[PDB]
Design a protein around this ligand. Structure first.
Ligand SMILES: [Cl-]
Lengths: 231, 243, 244, 250, 240, 241, 235, 111, 195
C-alpha cells in the first residue's frame, strides 16, 4: 500500500511487496513442468502465442551441454538470467575444466536475484525458472523464484494452473522417479503432468515444448514435428 | 508520521521502524538454534517439508564459513546467503593478511558492522534474518546471535524463528541443569529434542531435521554436518521425548 | 530512497514555465534597485544599497558594483554570495580569453558565457538556480559602449537604459520618459540619480545608501577608464544635482 | 548505496524566499549573543560562555578562535557547525593563499573564502546550510583593522561595530549610542563588556566571558627571535584574570 | 551525478515534460518560414513591450549555423543558444571529416537528435524550443525548409510557422500558398512572409525581422526601411 | 513534513533527526558516570543482562580504543560498536601519521566532527549514541571528553549520561561544591573507583552486585577494564566502611 | 512519485505498460509475410497540408536483407535504427556473412529494458522488422519496448491495429503471392486510416531474397492503389 | 629482463581435396634442445567440422584454440544453433588475432 | 614538406611554399599546396612531420571557422597567431607533440596593415618583416637582410621572392619542385599561377 513503492522498503508485517508483485508475473505466465528420474531430467512447457498469426513464445533455453532451464513470466528477465548461467557454466569450464554443478548454478542465481531486492533504484527479476541438469551426482531439478529462493525437487511446475501438474506429480512420485534408462517414458509422464493444467486448449504440434538431459544425452530441445510422437 | 517509510530515519522515540519491520520477517521464518558446549558449538534448524516432491537431505540450510565457523539463520533465506558470502570474504581477507583463521569474536564484529551499515542509509534495506553462528578458535568455543539492527552478543544458547520462545525455555533448562557443561554428543541430541519441541509452533507441515557441530575433540575444531548413524540416533532420542 | 525529498528544480509547469526561475525572479524583485544608462561618451552604473545601518563601514564596502576587468563592470541585484561565485567565473573567463588571443574579451562573449552557466542550472543537475540578475556595463573596439542584463533563466538582452531589482516597472517608465540618444555621461548621471530618488522605498536618497560608477573614454586619448565612486564623491555628485 | 542526494535541498519558494537559509538565520537568533567593536588601533570580539553543565570545563570549549596570527573569529548559532568551519577556514588560508604568496591573506579575502564555503552549502547536492553567523576581526598591512559579519547565505558586510544572536537588537542600539570614530582599543573593550552585561543573565566574570583582541604585534607570543620582519601575532585572547581587572573599573 | 528520470510516461501514454516543453514554444514569439522557387525566407516577430532596446547588440532571432544554413526558433531563448552552439560545432566537424558542408536535412537531423536525447536521459529536462532550419545543400539550388520540436521529430515544409498565434498564421499560409506555384521571386516570397506575420503582429515597425537565404551562401538580413516598404505596400492594397 | 525525516532545518531552525537520535541514546536504559582522581580517570556504567541465555562476558558498553584511551557508550550496541571501530582506526592512523599517541580531547574533536557531518549531510543518519572518552593525557592529565549526535563536545571535571543522569550530575555538583576542588583527592585508583560506585549508589538509590556494574580505569600509559572479581573486591571495601 | 522500474500489483512494469499506450496513439503500420517476400506498409499521417509528405520517413533500411517500419513516438526510433544498422554491419565484419533476422531483432530488443535509475525511460515506439536469411527464409517480427518480440505471418501496429489485425486474421493464408500481399496492405490501411488513402499519405515497401529491401516510388504505389480499387468494384 | 615468449617447435600442414580436407601436425613439443613431450597433440576438432592448429608458442597456441572453441559455442547460443561455416570461422579468427596486434599471439594458424 | 617562406611588404604578406612531397627515394607529388585559409584575410603555411602537418592545419582551420560563425566576425591576425601559438605550446608537453612549424600571413582590416608571424613547433612566436622555416632560412635571411626594404610594393616583393627561390634552387641539396605563391592583402587571399 504505502510500502510497495520500491524493493528497499519493508511493510509493517515484514513483507517485500515489489518482490511479491514480481512473483505475481510468474503466476500469469504459461504453465511449465519439470520432473526427473535417476538417469534423466525432463522439462515440458506449454507455449503461448499473441494470436493465430504469431509464433509461440519459446520457454526453454540451453545453458550448457549438461544444463538448461524453462521460464514463466517476463521473458527478457529469463534471457538476462540464462545468459548469466551460460557465463558461469562457461567460466567453470575454461578456468577449472569442470562442468558446473547444478547445485552451484542454483546458489549463483539465488545471489544474483537477492542483490536486486536490497538496493534503491533496482527491481526484482519478474520470472520463475525450472533448471534441469546432469552432473557428477546424477540428474537434478531446481526451482528458481525471483525472491532469491532456489529449491531442489524430484518434480514441480510453475505458471498459471501449475497446481494441477504439481498435485499429479506428487501422486505419481513413486512411479516416475524409477523411470531409469527410458527417455520416452519419462517424457510421457511429464506430458501427462502438464495435461492436468490445460483448460479449453489441448497440446498441439506448435504448442508443446519438451527438453531432456541425462546420463548419455546432452541437453536438447524438441519442437514442431519432433513432439508429435507425444500427443 | 511517515517515519516508518524510509530506512535510517529516527522516529520521535529514537527508533528505526524499518529494522523493526525486518524483525517481523525473521519471526515469520522457521526455527533455528545454537547450543554452546564443553569444547564447541552445535547448530540445528527446522526444514518445513512443503511437498512430497522435495528431495530429502538435498536443500541444505546450515552454511560453513572458512573451515571452522558454522552459520544458520531464520527469515529471508536469500538475505542470509548474502550475509554468509560477505562473511566468507571477510574471513578470507583476515586469513590473507594475518595468516591465522579468523577468531569468532573478530568474525562476529565483521558481520555486525556490515549489518549495522545497512541501517545507516535510505538507499539500502535492512537484513531480513537473525543469524546464529559460531565455532572454535585459539580461546575455545564461541556462540553468537546477530539481529537485523546489527546487534549481537555471545550466548550460552540461542534461538530464533517462529518457535523461538519454546526453544528459549528449553535452552534455559539446560543451562540451569548443567552448570559444569554439556558434552558435544549430548548437545547434538538436545538440539534434536529442542527442534522437535519448537516444531509445535509450526505443526501443519511436518519437517526435516538438520544438525551440524564444531568440537575440539569430536570434529578436531572443524565444522562438520551430522549425518547417518549419529543423525538417526539424535532423531530417535528426540522422538522418545515428545511421547 | 531519496526521490521523496527531491524538489525537481529543473522541470516545466503545465503552462511551460520554469518554477525555480520564476521564484528566483520574485526574490530579485525585493533586492535594491540598480540602474544602467548608456550615453554616447560613456556609461553610468547606479545602485541602491539594501537598508543600511549607521554602524556599517561604507568606504571599504562593496555589495552592488563589481569590476570584471579594466573594461567591464557589473551591477548586482539578488543574493550577493551567488553573485560572487559568478563574478569569479567571469573574471577567470576574461583572463582565459586574453591569454588565448592576446586581446581583451568582447563584452557580449563574456555576457553569453555567464548567461550559459545560468542556463545550465535550469536544464540539468537538479540544483537551484543562481538568484542573481546582472547589469553589464563595458567597452570594446567593435561595438563601443554596451549595456546588457542577464537573469536566472540565462537569458540576456542589450539596452540603452535598464533597471534590475526592486521597482523596475516604475524605474523603466521614468527612464523611457527622459532618455534620448544624443545624451552625455553627465546627463546620464543625473537621470540615474533622479530615477532612484523617485523609485526608492526609503525616505530620502543619501550618499551612504548608494554605489556609483562610470565607464568613460574620459581618460587621455582613445582609452577607457573605470571610476568606482568613493563615498565623498557620491556626496558631492548628489549635491551637484541638488538632490541633497 | 552512495549519496543519492545529488539535488538541492535549498530551493526557492513561490514567494521568493530560500526556506533553509531563513530557518538557519532563525537558529542564529536562538544562539547566544556575540559582538564586535572596531577601534582606531584595534578590534575586540566578545561572547558569553554558556556552560552546558557546571561539571563541564568551559575552558576546553573555545568560542573565539584564531584563524591566522592577525585574524580571529566568533559566532552565534550552532557550535558544531562553527567548529568545522574554523577547521576549513584555517586550511583555506594556507591552501588558497599562504602556500601561493608566502604570507597570510588579508581579512576581506579570508572572509570571502569562508563565505564561499557557506554559499556552497546553500546550493550543492544533499546538504543543509550552516546554522551560524560569524564575526571575523582582523588586521593586514594595506587595509588596517576590519570587522566582518558572515551569514548562512554566504553574504558578508563590513562593520564599525555590531552584535549577533539572542539580544542583538538591543545590543546594536547600545553600540550606536557609544561608538565614535575616535575610540581607542581600551575604550572599545570597556564598551564591549558593558554591552555584553545587558544580554548576560547569570554570572558575569572572566570565566563566563570569552574575549579576544586584534591590536599591536605581540613579540612575546611569537616563540622565537632573530627575524626582524616577523614581529608576532596581533590576535590575542584575554585571560580570565585580565577580564576581571577591567570589570572593577566598569 | 544527478540521475532523476524527469521525462517519463503517464498512464495515458504521454510524456508530460515533453508536452510542457511545447507550451514554452507556444509562449515564444512567432517565427515563420516560407520557401520560394529559388529562396527561403525566415520571418520573426519581436514583442514591443520592450522599448529602450539596443538592437545593434541584442541577440538576433535568426542565427547562421554555417555560411549556407540558418536557424530560427520559438521558445526559451537561453535554451536555443545551446542548440545553436552544438549545431555550429557539428557544422565545422562535418566539413572536417566529409570535406563538404552539411546538407540542411543532415544539420536538421542532428539538431533533432540532440533534442530527442534530452527526452530520455536522466537528470535533464527537454529543450523548450522548436526550430525552423533553412538553407541550400552544397552545389544545389533547390530550397530547403525543415522544422524540429522538443520531442525530437523533424520534417520538411513548403511553408511553416511556430510560436504564439502560429495556428492563425498557419491558417493564412494554408490558403495563400500554392504548391503548384511557389513565390517565383525573392520579392514575392518576402511579401507572403510579411503578410502572414501581419495577421498576428501589430505594427510593422521594429516588430518584424526578415532574413533571405539564396543559393551558394547568399544570406542577408533586411533593415527596418526595407521591411517597412513591404508593410506600407501591403496595407494600401488591403484598403479595397 | 519531510523536514523531520532528514537533517534539514525546520521552520524554527531545529534538526529533529538529531533530536530523535538523542532519544535513541536512552534506549538501553543504562546509566554511566566518569570522575577524575589525581593520577587516574575512572568510568563506571550499569550492566544489565536480562536474558539467562546470554554469555555475560560479551555484554559490554566500555571499549579500549587505544592503549591510553577508553570509551563508554550510551546508546544501542550496533551504533556503539560502529563508533568504537572508527575511533580505534582513527587513533591508530593518528599515531602512524604524527608519531605520537592521539590525545583523548583530539579523538573527541575528530569523532565530534564526523558526527557533525551526519547532521549536515542528508544520506548519512546520526548515530544514536553519546560517547564518553577517558584517559590520563601526557600533557593535560586526567581527562574526560564527551560527544553527542549533534557533534557537540566539551571537557569535564566529571560527568554522567543516561536516563537518570540529572540525579547523578547534581549529586556530583554538590560534592564538588563541598570539596572545593576539580577532582577526587585520592592517591590510588581503587578508592576513586570506590568513590564512583558510592556516589552512583546514592544518586540512583540502588544496591549493586558484582554483575550489575562495569568499570574502566585510565592510568598513565594504560586504560583497562575490571573483572567481576575486581569489582567484587571493590564492593566489599565500600561495605566494610 | 515512484521508481521508474516499479512493478504494479498485477506483476507488470508501470513504465512499459504506459509506453504501450503511447504506441496506440501512433500511426498505423502493417506487415505481411509470404513465400515470395515480406511487405511493409505505413500510414504517413501529415499533421498539416503544407508539410512535404515525402520527408516523413517511417519505413527504414537496416541492411540489404532487413527492413523496418515504426509506430508511436518515432523520434525514439532513431537510436534503435542506429543500433540495428551497427549490429548488422558489425556482424558482417566479424563473420563475413549476413546476420540472421531473428538475431538482429534480439539485439534491438536488448536495448529495450536498459532503462531505470542506461536511459531514463522505455522507448515509446514499436517496430516491425522484416527480412530474409538462408536458414529461416522470409520473416516478420514485432519488437516491443518490453524487450519481447514475436514472429508474425502478418501484423498491424498503431491506432488502427486491433481492427486491422482482425482483418489480417481472415485474409492471410500460406499461399499468398507478393502482389496479393501488396494489395492487402493497401486495402487494410485504407480501412483504418482517417483521411482517404493515396500515394502521398501511405507508403509501401518489400524485402525479397533477389532484390533485397526496396521502398516503392509514389508512382508504383499509385498504380497498386488503382489496381486495388478496380478489383473491389469487379464483384 | 622477462621474455614473455618461447618457441615450442613442431610443424603443421593442411591440404584440401574435392570433398575432403586434412590437417596434419607432428606430436613433438620442445624448448631449446630438450623434448617436453613425444605426444602432445596440437591439431584439434573445434566442432562444426572445423579442425584448427596454432603452431609456434604453445601457450599462445592453446589460448587461441581455447578462445575460438569458446567462440563456436557462443555463436550457437546467439544465432539459433546455426552452423559456423569455414569462411565465417576464418573471419572470426582474424579478429581474435588482430585484437592482440600490439602484443601478438606468436603462432602460425591453419584451419 | 620542407620549404616555407614569407615576406611582409607595404600593403601585403606573400607566402611561398614548396610543392614536393617526398617519401623515401620517391617524389610522390609535385603540386602539393602546403597552406590553409583560416579566414578571408588570414593564411597559414606549414611544414614538418608527415600526417601531423595537415592534421594540425585543418584542426586550426576548423576552430577559426567555428569562431567566425559564432561571433559573425573575423579575428585579427594577431589574435589568430596567439591562438595557434598556445595550441603548439600545449602540444609540446603532450604524450605525442605536433611536429609542425607554421607561418601566418594576415591583413589586419582594423589597422590596414599586413602582418607575418613565424611560429615553430615549440610555440615560439615572433612577428617579422620576412620569415622562413627549416634550412631555407640559412640562405634567405641574409639575402633578405640585404635586398629587403620596408616600403616595397607587392610586385617588388614577388621579385624579391624570385631571388630567394633562385638561390634555393642553386644551393639546396633536394629538388623541392618549385613553390606555390599566395598574396594576402586588403582584398583577401589570391594565388599566383605562373611562378
Ligand atoms: Cl576532522
Amino acid at each position: 500500500n504505502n510500502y510497495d513503492g520500491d524493493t528497499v522498503t519493508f511493510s509493517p508485517t515484514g513483507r517485500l511487496f515489489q518482490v511479491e508483485y514480481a512473483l505475481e508475473a510468474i503466476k500469469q505466465g504459461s504453465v511449465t513442468v519439470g520432473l526427473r528420474s535417476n538417469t534423466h531430467a525432463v522439462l515440458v512447457a506449454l507455449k503461448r502465442n499473441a494470436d493465430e498469426l504469431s509464433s509461440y513464445q519459446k520457454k526453454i533455453i540451453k545453458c550448457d551441454e549438461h544444463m538448461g532451464l524453462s521460464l514463466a513470466g517476463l521473458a527478457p528477465d529469463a534471457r538476462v538470467l540464462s545468459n548469466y548461467l551460460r557465463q558461469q557454466c562457461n567460466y567453470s569450464s575454461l578456468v577449472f575444466n569442470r562442468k558446473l554443478a547444478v547445485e552451484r548454478a542454483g546458489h549463483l542465481l539465488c545471489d544474483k536475484a537477492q542483490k536486486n531486492t536490497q538496493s534503491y533504484g533496482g527491481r526484482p527479476y519478474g520470472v520463475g525458472l525450472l533448471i534441469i541438469g546432469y552432473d557428477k551426482s546424477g540428474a537434478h531439478l531446481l526451482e528458481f523464484q525471483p525472491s532469491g529462493n532456489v529449491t531442489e525437487l524430484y518434480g514441480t511446475a510453475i505458471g498459471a494452473r501449475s497446481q494441477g501438474a504439481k498435485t499429479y506429480l506428487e501422486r505419481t512420485l513413486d512411479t516416475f522417479i524409477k523411470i531409469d534408462g527410458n527417455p520416452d517414458e519419462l517424457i510421457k509422464a511429464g506430458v501427462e503432468a502438464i495435461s492436468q493444467s490445460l483448460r479449453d486448449e489441448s497440446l498441439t504440434v506448435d504448442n508443446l515444448s519438451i527438453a531432456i538431459v541425462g546420463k548419455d544425452t546432452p541437453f536438447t530441445i524438441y519442437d514442431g514435428e519432433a513432439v508429435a510422437k507425444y500427443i | 508520521t511517515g517515519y516508518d517509510l524510509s530506512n535510517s530515519v529516527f522516529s520521535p522515540d529514537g527508533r528505526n521502524f524499518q529494522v523493526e519491520y525486518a524483525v517481523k520477517a525473521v519471526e515469520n521464518g522457521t526455527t533455528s538454534i545454537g547450543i554452546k558446549c564443553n569444547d564447541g558449538v552445535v547448530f540445528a534448524v527446522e526444514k518445513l517439508i512443503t511437498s512430497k516432491l522435495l528431495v530429502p537431505q538435498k536443500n541444505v540450510k546450515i552454511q560453513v564459513v572458512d573451515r571452522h565457523i558454522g552459520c544458520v539463520y531464520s527469515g529471508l533465506i536469500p538475505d542470509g546467503r548474502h550475509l554468509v558470502n560477505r562473511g566468507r570474504e571477510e574471513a578470507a581477507s583476515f586469513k590473507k593478511l594475518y595468516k591465522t583463521p579468523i577468531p569468532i569474536p573478530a568474525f562476529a564484529d565483521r558481520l555486525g558492522q556490515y549489518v549495522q551499515a545497512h541501517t545507516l542509509y535510505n538507499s539500502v534495506r535492512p537484513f531480513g534474518v537473525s543469524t546464529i553462528f559460531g565455532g572454535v578458535d585459539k580461546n575455545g568455543a564461541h556462540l553468537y546471535m546477530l539481529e537485523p539492527s546489527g546487534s549481537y552478543w555471545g550466548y550460552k544458547g540461542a534461538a530464533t524463528g517462529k518457535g523461538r520462545q519454546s526453544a528459549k525455555a528449553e535452552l534455559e533448562k539446560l543451562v540451569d541443569h548443567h552448570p559444569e557443561g554439556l558434552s558435544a554428543r549430548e548437545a547434538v541430541k538436545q538440539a534434536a529434542k529442542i527442534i522437535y519441541l519448537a516444531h509445535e509452533d509450526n505443526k501443519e507441515k511436518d519437517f526435516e531435521l538438520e544438525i551440524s557441530w564444531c568440537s575440539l575433540s569430536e570434529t578436531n575444531g572443524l565444522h562438520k554436518f551430522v549425518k547417518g548413524d549419529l543423525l538417526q540416533e539424535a532423531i530417535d532420542f528426540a522422538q522418545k521425548e515428545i511421547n | 530512497g531519496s526521490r521523496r525529498y527531491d524538489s525537481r528544480t529543473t522541470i516545466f509547469s503545465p503552462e511551460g514555465r520554469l518554477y525555480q526561475v520564476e521564484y528566483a525572479l520574485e526574490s530579485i524583485s525585493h533586492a535594491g534597485t540598480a540602474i544602467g544608462i548608456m550615453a554616447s561618451d560613456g556609461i553610468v552604473l547606479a545602485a541602491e544599497r539594501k537598508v543600511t545601518s549607521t554602524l556599517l563601514e561604507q568606504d571599504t564596502s562593496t555589495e552592488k558594483l563589481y569590476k570584471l576587468n579594466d573594461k567591464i563592470a557589473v551591477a548586482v541585484a539578488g543574493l550577493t554570495a551567488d553573485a560572487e561565485i559568478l563574478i569569479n567565473t567571469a573574471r577567470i573567463h576574461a583572463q582565459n580569453y586574453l591569454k588565448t588571443y592576446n586581446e581583451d574579451i568582447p563584452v557580449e562573449i563574456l555576457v553569453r558565457r555567464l548567461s550559459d552557466i545560468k542556463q545550465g542550472y535550469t536544464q540539468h543537475g537538479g540544483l537551484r538556480p543562481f538568484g542573481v540578475s546582472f547589469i553589464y556595463a563595458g567597452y570594446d573596439d567593435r561595438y563601443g559602449y554596451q549595456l546588457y542584463t542577464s537573469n536566472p533563466s540565462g537569458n540576456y538582452t542589450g539596452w540603452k537604459a535598464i533597471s534590475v531589482g526592486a521597482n523596475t516597472s516604475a524605474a523603466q517608465t521614468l527612464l523611457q520618459m527622459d532618455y534620448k540618444d544624443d545624451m552625455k555621461v553627465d546627463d546620464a548621471i543625473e537621470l540615474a540619480l533622479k530615477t532612484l530618488s523617485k523609485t526608492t522605498d526609503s525616505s530620502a536618497l543619501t550618499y551612504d545608501r548608494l554605489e556609483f560608477a562610470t565607464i568613460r573614454k574620459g581618460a587621455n586619448d582613445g582609452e577607457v577608464y573605470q571610476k568606482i565612486f568613493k563615498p565623498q564623491e557620491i556626496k558631492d555628485i548628489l549635491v551637484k544635482t541638488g538632490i541633497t | 548505496m552512495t549519496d543519492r542526494y545529488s539535488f538541492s535541498l535549498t530551493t526557492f519558494s513561490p514567494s521568493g524566499k530560500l526556506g533553509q537559509i531563513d530557518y538557519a538565520l532563525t537558529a542564529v537568533k536562538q544562539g547566544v549573543t556575540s559582538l564586535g567593536i572596531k577601534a582606531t588601533n584595534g578590534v575586540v570580539i566578545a561572547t558569553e560562555k554558556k556552560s552546558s553543565s557546571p561539571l563541564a570545563m568551559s575552558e576546553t570549549l573555545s568560542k573565539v578562535s584564531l584563524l591566522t596570527p592577525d585574524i580571529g573569529a566568533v559566532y552565534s548559532g550552532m557550535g558544531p557547525d562553527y567548529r568545522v568551519l574554523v577547521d576549513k577556514s584555517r586550511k583555506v588560508a594556507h591552501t588558497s593563499y599562504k602556500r601561493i604568496y608566502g604570507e597570510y591573506p588579508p581579512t576581506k579575502l579570508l572572509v570571502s573564502e569562508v563565505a564561499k564555503i557557506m554559499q556552497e552549502a546553500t546550493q550543492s547536492g544533499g546538504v543543509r546550510p550552516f546554522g551560524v553567523s560569524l564575526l571575523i576581526a582582523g588586521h593586514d598591512e594595506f587595509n588596517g583593522f576590519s570587522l566582518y559579519q558572515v551569514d548562512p547565505s554566504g553574504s558578508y558586510f563590513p562593520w564599525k561595530a555590531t552584535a549577533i544572536g539572542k539580544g542583538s537588537v538591543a545590543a546594536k542600539t547600545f553600540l550606536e549610542k557609544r561608538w565614535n570614530d575616535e575610540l581607542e582599543l581600551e575604550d572599545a573593550i570597556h564598551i564591549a563588556l558593558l554591552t555584553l552585561k545587558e544580554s548576560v543573565e547569570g554570572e558575569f566574570n572572566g570565566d563566563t566571558i570569552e574575549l579576544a583582541i586584534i591590536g599591536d604585534e605581540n613579540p612575546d607570543l611569537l616563540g622565537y627571535t632573530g627575524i626582524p620582519t616577523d614581529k608576532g601575532p596581533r590576535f590575542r585572547k584575554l585571560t580570565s584574570q585580565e577580564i576581571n581587572d577591567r570589570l572593577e573599573a566598569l | 551525478g544527478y540521475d532523476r528520470a524527469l521525462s517519463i510516461f503517464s498512464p495515458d501514454g504521454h510524456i508530460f515534460q515533453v508536452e510542457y516543453a511545447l507550451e514554452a514554444v507556444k509562449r515564444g514569439t512567432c517565427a515563420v518560414g516560407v520557401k520560394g522557387k529559388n529562396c527561403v525566407v525566415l520571418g520573426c516577430e519581436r514583442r514591443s513591450t520592450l522599448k529602450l532596446q539596443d538592437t545593434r547588440i541584442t541577440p538576433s532571432k535568426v542565427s547562421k549555423i554555417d555560411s549556407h544554413v540558418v536557424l530560427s526558433f520559438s521558445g526559451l531563448n537561453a535554451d536555443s543558444r545551446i542548440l545553436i552552439e552544438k549545431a555550429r560545432v557539428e557544422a565545422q566537424s562535418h566539413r572536417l571529416t566529409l570535406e563538404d558542408p552539411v546538407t540542411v536535412e543532415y544539420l536538421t537531423r542532428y539538431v533533432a537528435g540532440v533534442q530527442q536525447r534530452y527526452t530520455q536521459s536522466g537528470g535533464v529536462r527537454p529543450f523548450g524550443v522548436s526550430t525552423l532550419i533553412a538553407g541550400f545543400d552544397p552545389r544545389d539550388d533547390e530550397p530547403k525548409l525543415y522544422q524540429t520540436e522538443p520531442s525530437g521529430i523533424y520534417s520538411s515544409w513548403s511553408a511553416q510557422t511556430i510560436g504564439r498565434n502560429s495556428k492563425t498564421v498557419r491558417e493564412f499560409l494554408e490558403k495563400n500558398y500554392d504548391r503548384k506555384e511557389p513565390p517565383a521571386t525573392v520579392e514575392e516570397c518576402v511579401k507572403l512572409t510579411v503578410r502572414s506575420l501581419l495577421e498576428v503582429v501589430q505594427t510593422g515597425a521594429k516588430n518584424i525581422e526578415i532574413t533571405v537565404v539564396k543559393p551558394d551562401s547568399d544570406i542577408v538580413a533586411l533593415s527596418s526601411e526595407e521591411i517597412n516598404q513591404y508593410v506600407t505596400q501591403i496595407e494600401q492594397e488591403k484598403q479595397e | 513534513g519531510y523536514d523531520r525525516h532528514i537533517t534539514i532545518f525546520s521552520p524554527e531552525g531545529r534538526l529533529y533527526q538529531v533530536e530523535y537520535a538523542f532519544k535513541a541514546t536512552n534506549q538501553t536504559n543504562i546509566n554511566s558516570l566518569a570522575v577524575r582522581g589525581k593520577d587516574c580517570t575512572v568510568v563506571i556504567s550499569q550492566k544489565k543482562v536480562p536474558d539467562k541465555l546470554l554469555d555475560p562476558t560479551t555484554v559490554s558498553y566500555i571499549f579500549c580504543i587505544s592503549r591510553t584511551i577508553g570509551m563508554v557508550v550510551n546508546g544501542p550496541i550496533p551504533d556503539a560498536r560502529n563508533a568504537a571501530l572508527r575511533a580505534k582506526a582513527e587513533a591508530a592512523e593518528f599515531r602512524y601519521k604524527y608519531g605520537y599517541d592521539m590525545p583523548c580531547d583530539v579523538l573527541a574533536k575528530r569523532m565530534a566532527n564526523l558526527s557533525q557531518i551526519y547532521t549536515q549531510r542528508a544520506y548519512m543518519r546520526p548515530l544514536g549514541v553519546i560517547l564518553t572518552f577517558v584517559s590520563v593525557d601526557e600533557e593535560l592529565g586526567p581527562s574526560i571528553y564527551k560527544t553527542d549526535p549533534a557533534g557537540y563536545y566539551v571537557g569535564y571535571k566529571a560527568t554522567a549520561t543516561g536516563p537518570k543522569q540529572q540525579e547523578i550530575t547534581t549529586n556530583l555538583e554538590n560534592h564538588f561544591k563541598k570539596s572545593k576542588i576539580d577532582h577526587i583527592n585520592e592517591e590510588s585508583w581503587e578508592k576513586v573507583v570506590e568513590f564512583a560506585i558510592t556516589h552512583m549508589i546514592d544518586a540512583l538509590g540502588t544496591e549493586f552486585s558484582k554483575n550489575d556494574l562495569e568499570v574502566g580505569v585510565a592510568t598513565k600509559d594504560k586504560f583497562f577494564t575490571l573483572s567481576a572479581e575486581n569489582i567484587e573486591e571493590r564492593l566489599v571495601a565500600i561495605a566494610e566502611q | 512519485d515512484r521508481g521508474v522500474s516499479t512493478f504494479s500489483p498485477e506483476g507488470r512494469l508501470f513504465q512499459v505498460e504506459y509506453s504501450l499506450e503511447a504506441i496506440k496513439l501512433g500511426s498505423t503500420a502493417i506487415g505481411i509475410a509470404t513465400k515470395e517476400g515480406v511487405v511493409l506498409g505505413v500510414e504517413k499521417r501529415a499533421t498539416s497540408p503544407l508539410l512535404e509528405s515525402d520527408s516523413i520517413e517511417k519505413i527504414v533500411e537496416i541492411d540489404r536483407h532487413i527492413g523496418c517500419a515504426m509506430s508511436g513516438l518515432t523520434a525514439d526510433a532513431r537510436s534503435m535504427i542506429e543500433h540495428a544498422r551497427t549490429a548488422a554491419v558489425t556482424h558482417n565484419l566479424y563473420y563475413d556473412e549476413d546476420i540472421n533476422v531473428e538475431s538482429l531483432t534480439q539485439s534491438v530488443c536488448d536495448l529495450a529494458l536498459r532503462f531505470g535509475e542506461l536511459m531514463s525511460r522505455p522507448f515509446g515506439v514499436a517496430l516491425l522488422i522484416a527480412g530474409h536469411d538462408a536458414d529461416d527464409g522470409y520473416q516478420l517480427f514485432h519488437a516491443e519496448p518490453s524487450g519481447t518480440f514475436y514472429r508474425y505471418n502478418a501484423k498491424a501496429i498503431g491506432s488502427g491495429s486491433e481492427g486491422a489485425q482482425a482483418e489480417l486474421l481472415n485474409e492471410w493464408h500460406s499461399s499468398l503471392t507478393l502482389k496479393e500481399a501488396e494489395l492487402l496492405v493497401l486495402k487494410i490501411l485504407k480501412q483504418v486510416m482517417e483521411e482517404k488513402l493515396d500515394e502521398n499519405n501511405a507508403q509501401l515497401s518489400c524485402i525479397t531474397k533477389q532484390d533485397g529491401f526496396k521502398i516503392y516510388d509514389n508512382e508504383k504505389t499509385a498504380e497498386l492503389i488503382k489496381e486495388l480499387k478496380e478489383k473491389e468494384a469487379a464483384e | 629482463q622477462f621474455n614473455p615468449y618461447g618457441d615450442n617447435g613442431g610443424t603443421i600442414l593442411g591440404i584440401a581435396g574435392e570433398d575432403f580436407a586434412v590437417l596434419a601436425g607432428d606430436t613433438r613439443n620442445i624448448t631449446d634442445y630438450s623434448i617436453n613431450s613425444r605426444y602432445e597433440p596440437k591439431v584439434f576438432d573445434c566442432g562444426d567440422n572445423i579442425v584448427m592448429s596454432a603452431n609456434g608458442f604453445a601457450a599462445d597456441g592453446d589460448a587461441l584454440v581455447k578462445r575460438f572453441k569458446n567462440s563456436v559455442k557462443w555463436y550457437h547460443f546467439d544465432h539459433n544453433d546455426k552452423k559456423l561455416s569455414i569462411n565465417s570461422a576464418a573471419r572470426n579468427i582474424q579478429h581474435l588475432l588482430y585484437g592482440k596486434r600490439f602484443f601478438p599471439y606468436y603462432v602460425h594458424t591453419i584451419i | 614538406m620542407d620549404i616555407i617562406l614569407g615576406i611582409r611588404v607595404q600593403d601585403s604578406v606573400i607566402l611561398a611554399s614548396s610543392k614536393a612531397v617526398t617519401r623515401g627515394i620517391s617524389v610522390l607529388k609535385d603540386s602539393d599546396d602546403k597552406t590553409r585559409q583560416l579566414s578571408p584575410h588570414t593564411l597559414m603555411s606549414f611544414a614538418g612531420e608527415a600526417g601531423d602537418t595537415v592534421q594540425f592545419a585543418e584542426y586550426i582551420q576548423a576552430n577559426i571557422q567555428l569562431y567566425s560563425i559564432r561571433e559573425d566576425y573575423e579575428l585579427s591576425p594577431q589574435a589568430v597567431s596567439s591562438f595557434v601559438r598556445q595550441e603548439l605550446a600545449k602540444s609540446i608537453r603532450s604524450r605525442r607533440p605536433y611536429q609542425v612549424n607554421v607561418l601566418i600571413g594576415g591583413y589586419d582590416k582594423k589597422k590596414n596593415k599586413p602582418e607575418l608571424y613565424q611560429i615553430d613547433y615549440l610555440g615560439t612566436k615572433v612577428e617579422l618583416p620576412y620569415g622562413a622555416h627549416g634550412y631555407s632560412g640559412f640562405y634567405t635571411f641574409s639575402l633578405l637582410d640585404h635586398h629587403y626594404r620596408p616600403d616595397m610594393t607587392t610586385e617588388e616583393g614577388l621579385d624579391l621572392l624570385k631571388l630567394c627561390v633562385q638561390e634555393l634552387e642553386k644551393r639546396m641539396p633536394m629538388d623541392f619542385k618549385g613553390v606555390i605563391v599566395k598574396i594576402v592583402d586588403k582584398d583577401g587571399i589570391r594565388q599566383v599561377d605562373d611562378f
